[PDB]
Amino acid sequence: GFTAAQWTEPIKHMSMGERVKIKLMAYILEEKDVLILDQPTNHLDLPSREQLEETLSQYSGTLLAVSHDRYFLEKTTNSKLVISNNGIEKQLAAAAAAAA
Amino acid sequence: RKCVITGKKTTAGNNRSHAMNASKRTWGANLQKVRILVNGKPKKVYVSARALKSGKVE
Amino acid sequence: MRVNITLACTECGERNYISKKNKRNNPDRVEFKKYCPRDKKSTLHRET
Amino acid sequence: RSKAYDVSEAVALVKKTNTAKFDATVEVAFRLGVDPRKNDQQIRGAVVLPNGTGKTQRVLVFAKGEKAKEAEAAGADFVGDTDYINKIQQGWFDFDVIVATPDMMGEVGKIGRVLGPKGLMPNPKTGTVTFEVEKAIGEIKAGKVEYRVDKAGNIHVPIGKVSFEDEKLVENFTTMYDTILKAKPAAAKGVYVKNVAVTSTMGPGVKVDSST
Amino acid sequence: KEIVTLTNVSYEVKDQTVFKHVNASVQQGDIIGIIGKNGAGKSTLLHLIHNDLAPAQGQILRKDIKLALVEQETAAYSFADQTPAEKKLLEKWHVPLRDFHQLSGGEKLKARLAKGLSEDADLLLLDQPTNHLDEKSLQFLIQQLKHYNGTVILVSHDRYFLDEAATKIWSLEDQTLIEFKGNYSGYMKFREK
RNA sequence: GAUAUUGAAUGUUGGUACAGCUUGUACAGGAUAGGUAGGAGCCUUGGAAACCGGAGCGCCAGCUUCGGUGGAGGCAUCGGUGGGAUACUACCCUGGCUGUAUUGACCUUCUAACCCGCCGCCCUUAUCGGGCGGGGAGACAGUGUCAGGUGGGCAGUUUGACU
RNA sequence: GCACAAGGGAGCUUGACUGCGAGACCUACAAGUCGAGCAGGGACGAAAGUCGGGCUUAGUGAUCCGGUGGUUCCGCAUGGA
Ligand SMILES: Nc1ncnc2c1ncn2[C@@H]1O[C@H](COP(=O)(O)OP(=O)(O)OP(=O)(O)O)[C@@H](O)[C@H]1O
Numbered sequence: 001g002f003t004a005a006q007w008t009e010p011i012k013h014m015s016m017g018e019r020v021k022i023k024l025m026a027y028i029l030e031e032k033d034v035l036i037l038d039q040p041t042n043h044l045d046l047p048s049r050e051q052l053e054e055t056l057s058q059y060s061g062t063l064l065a066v067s068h069d070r071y072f073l074e075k076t077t078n079s080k081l082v083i084s085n086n087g088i089e090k091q092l093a094a095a096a097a098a099a100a
Numbered sequence: 101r102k103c104v105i106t107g108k109k110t111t112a113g114n115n116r117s118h119a120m121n122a123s124k125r126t127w128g129a130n131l132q133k134v135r136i137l138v139n140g141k142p143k144k145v146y147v148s149a150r151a152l153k154s155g156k157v158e
Numbered sequence: 159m160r161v162n163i164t165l166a167c168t169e170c171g172e173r174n175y176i177s178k179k180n181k182r183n184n185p186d187r188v189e190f191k192k193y194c195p196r197d198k199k200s201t202l203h204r205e206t
Numbered sequence: 207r208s209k210a211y212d213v214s215e216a217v218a219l220v221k222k223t224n225t226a227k228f229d230a231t232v233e234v235a236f237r238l239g240v241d242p243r244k245n246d247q248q249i250r251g252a253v254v255l256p257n258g259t260g261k262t263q264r265v266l267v268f269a270k271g272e273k274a275k276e277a278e279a280a281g282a283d284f285v286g287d288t289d290y291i292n293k294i295q296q297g298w299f300d301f302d303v304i305v306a307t308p309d310m311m312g313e314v315g316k317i318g319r320v321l322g323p324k325g326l327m328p329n330p331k332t333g334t335v336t337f338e339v340e341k342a343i344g345e346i347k348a349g350k351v352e353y354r355v356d357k358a359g360n361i362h363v364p365i366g367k368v369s370f371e372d373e374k375l376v377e378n379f380t381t382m383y384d385t386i387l388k389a390k391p392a393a394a395k396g397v398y399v400k401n402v403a404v405t406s407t408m409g410p411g412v413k414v415d416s417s418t
Numbered sequence: 419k420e421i422v423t424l425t426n427v428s429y430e431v432k433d434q435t436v437f438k439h440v441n442a443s444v445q446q447g448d449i450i451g452i453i454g455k456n457g458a459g460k461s462t463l464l465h466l467i468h469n470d471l472a473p474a475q476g477q478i479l480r481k482d483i484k485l486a487l488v489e490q491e492t493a494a495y496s497f498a499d500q501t502p503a504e505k506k507l508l509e510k511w512h513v514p515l516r517d518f519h520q521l522s523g524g525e526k527l528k529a530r531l532a533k534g535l536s537e538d539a540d541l542l543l544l545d546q547p548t549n550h551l552d553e554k555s556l557q558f559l560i561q562q563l564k565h566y567n568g569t570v571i572l573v574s575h576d577r578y579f580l581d582e583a584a585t586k587i588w589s590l591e592d593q594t595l596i597e598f599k600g601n602y603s604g605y606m607k608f609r610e611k
Numbered sequence: 612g613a614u615a616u617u618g619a620a621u622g623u624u625g626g627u628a629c630a631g632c633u634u635g636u637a638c639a640g641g642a643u644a645g646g647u648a649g650g651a652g653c654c655u656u657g658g659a660a661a662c663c664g665g666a667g668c669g670c671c672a673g674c675u676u677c678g679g680u681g682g683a684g685g686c687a688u689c690g691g692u693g694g695g696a697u698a699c700u701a702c703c704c705u706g707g708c709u710g711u712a713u714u715g716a717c718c719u720u721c722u723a724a725c726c727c728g729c730c731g732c733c734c735u736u737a738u739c740g741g742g743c744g745g746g747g748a749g750a751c752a753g754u755g756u757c758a759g760g761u762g763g764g765c766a767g768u769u770u771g772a773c774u
Numbered sequence: 775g776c777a778c779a780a781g782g783g784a785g786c787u788u789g790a791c792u793g794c795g796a797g798a799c800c801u802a803c804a805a806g807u808c809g810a811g812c813a814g815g816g817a818c819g820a821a822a823g824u825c826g827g828g829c830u831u832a833g834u835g836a837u838c839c840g841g842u843g844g845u846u847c848c849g850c851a852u853g854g855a
């Protein structure tokens with residue numbers, strides 16, 4: 001999952017384009033059954049965020065995926081929370097223009 | 101083949117390649133046959149292209 | 159791997175010495191105090 | 207406008223570039239050939255005009271200690287009670303020119319940008335912050351104006367009036383151009399001269415020669 | 419003309435040789451993009467050209483001194499709110515100034531990249547400007563960099579950001595830089611070929 | 612392929628040498644303030660408020676120019692804002708059009724160089740060549756130097772020792 | 775060959791020094807090996823002393839041609855190059 005023979009580096013003498021990866025391994029090694037991804041896809045790589053785009057679709061639910069990308073969430077969205085003026089908007093579709 | 105104005109003709113030297121292999125090679129005159137009055141008449145002789153630039157009357 | 163090492167001076171800047179070291183067991187630039195015959199004393203040297 | 211006029215013609219012609227009703231001021235623009243992004247190629251020096259500018263100044267000083275005692279006789283309007291920046295706070299119609307001395311400059315400076323976007327902040331790069339306050343009042347009223355360049359490398363200089371005679375602005379532009387030649391920094395890349403625009407206040411510019 | 423040249427530039431740390439036999443050129447307004455696997459010297463190269471890190475081998479020659487370094491995690495970034503062209507950036511993007519520690523992660527790169535664009539720079543050495551940005555700010559980047567004073571060198575990890583905002587690519591790979599001019603979409607067409 | 616024989620025009624996209632000048636707003640605001648310096652007034656019968664039309668940008672708020680109806684009105688400090696004041700001076704190269712001179716490249720087209728193992732006439736009873744007159748190709752081709760590729764078609768050679 | 779450690783620990787360290795080197799072994803040559811001691815500067819030790827790599831013997835190659843560094847060297851008349 002992207003490491004060289006780097007078993008012992010200090011983990012923010014690491015690369016810092018790892019250390020998102022360290023968090024990630026520490027999650028996905030242990031089947032924690034609930035994840036919340038407060039912006040994962042930005043430090044990662046085009047071969048790295050892609051497999052997280054893929055496997056999180058085959059993930060067994062209860063995911064809270066904050067992502068400022070528009071194309072990452074196209075594999076990891078069923079419902080949306082559009083935070084807006086005066087609090088949340090719990091959307092289940094696009095929910096624009098007030099369907100009539 | 102020599103130029104009629106000056107004594108400029110084909111010489112010979114070496115084709116020195118890489119590894120300094122000395123092949124044997126010739127060196128021609130840029131001559132360019134034109135019509136000039138070498139006598140009182142024009143005769144259409146060989147000239148040279150060194151001697152043709154601005155010097156000799158066409 | 160094992161690398162040839164020159165050890166240039168600091169008081170004189172002169173090279174004066176060679177020994178070998180690892181790039182893995184000694185990844186940092188190594189320094190010792192040796193004898194500088196231009197400086198005629200013990201002087202801290204420096205891999206260059 | 208295709209022709210570059212001479213110095214002896216443009217002084218007599220910026221007489222004729224007075225259009226409005228006030229007795230106008232002839233000023234000079236000069237395009238520099240230095241890099242304004244670098245702080246090393248920075249021309250910032252001022253000099254006295256031998257025939258003056260034609261305008262009344264009001265210089266207020268920040269003299270400290272004994273230096274106020276020679277500041278009240280040279281011609282300054284108001285010196286101060288050693289601190290009137292509190293009077294500067296919430297008010298302070300500034301008038302013409304602010305100079306200071308190299309002791310309280312730091313203290314006045316730590317007050318903020320009440321002088322930043324107003325162009326009067328004391329800075330010893332301009333010869334305005336010194337121990338000679340008596341010699342500093344007397345040369346600014348009769349000549350010297352604080353001169354520094356913009357963020358694109360240009361200097362503005364008031365050399366005088368419309369009503370000056372033809373032999374006044376020639377020495378004024380000669381003195382300022384010779385000053386620009388002595389104020390040339392090091393590592394100047396290429397051609398130093400780009401443009402001289404001699405103009406009046408109400409009229410366009412005339413691009414003229416530098417050395418005639 | 420070029421401005422910065424690189425020749426056989428290498429780097430040594432305690433993994434292995436990150437980086438070797440590196441020949442590249444920065445020019446007068448090129449939009450150069452670093453791509454590469456993370457950990458492959460993607461931003462160690464930026465500290466080599468900044469002279470933030472001294473390279474073990476190879477010669478790095480530069481001409482113009484101004485090196486704007488905008489990295490990841492600058493970790494209680496300063497509040498020298500000076501040279502107010504920064505505040506134009508700080509107010510198009512809709513970011514308040516008031517704190518640093520209580521801000522979200524989203525605002526802080528937009529308040530660091532703000533100070534970085536406007537100190538003065540004819541050369542940008544920036545790590546990742548496309549982390550926690552929305553599209554109204556991601557689109558604002560490309561209108562900055564197209565309408566920009568000089569050369570930009572960025573480490574994107576985006577096929578999105580480089581279809582618009584690239585002229586060269588300095589792809590880091592198996593310890594070797596290779597450069598390709600023109601786009602990123604045709605770049606992988608070039609690599610696969 | 613370049614260059615020399617080998618020049619005559621018409622467009623083209625870059626760049627200079629001389630030249631035109633326009634483009635400029637996060638919010639607060641009466642608005643579109645790029646900043647450094649002077650600044651309490653300037654513009655007007657060689658035309659102001661207003662209407663209208665169009666080149667032009669625009670982050671569509673409102674600006675910019677020019678021309679046409681109009682008839683003595685605009686506009687500035689100060690008033691307010693906010694980080695900073697509106698009447699000239701320059702620039703900033705962010706974002707255009709037009710002309711002069713060359714610069715590089717490309718497309719056409721011309722003809723006078725070159726070429727014609729094309730025709731006719733003469734030298735001349737000559738399938739040579741060469742003078743003239745047409746025709747065709749035509750800055751190409753050919754040819755000279757320089758260069759890269761290709762090149763057993765040819766050439767000199769090498770192709771070890773112990774055993 | 776070694777248990778007086780050459781085998782094991784820990785502290786402190788850079789002698790894995792510079793200029794050498796009487797005299798030897800080895801050997802066709804080119805080379806190779808050992809070297810007390812002297813001086814300069816050190817390390818450890820209270821001192822005596824020991825230290826010019828490792829327990830000895832392997833871990834490597836001539837010249838030519840180029841590179842780098844330094845030098846009271848030369849430098850095609852002179853000063854430089
Ligand atoms: N300071 C360091 N010291 C030792 N090893 C390092 C250091 N920095 C990085 N490394 C190793 O080299 C790898 C590459 O680091 P580099 O400097 O390329 O960051 P980067 O990969 O460019 O940043 P990103 O991961 O966002 O691309 C690191 O992941 C780490 O394994």
Ligand SMILES: Nc1ncnc2c1ncn2[C@@H]1O[C@H](COP(=O)(O)OP(=O)(O)OP(=O)(O)O)[C@@H](O)[C@H]1O
Nearest residue numbers: 039068513514517520521522523524525526550551
């Ligand atoms: N403790 C706090 N004090 C003051 N302001 C806060 C605090 N927490 C959040 N905010 C403000 O809330 C705004 C939005 O922050 P939020 O927590 O939504 O992160 P965000 O906007 O998604 O940014 P990012 O995407 O970088 O996380 C920010 O402008 C921030 O200043």
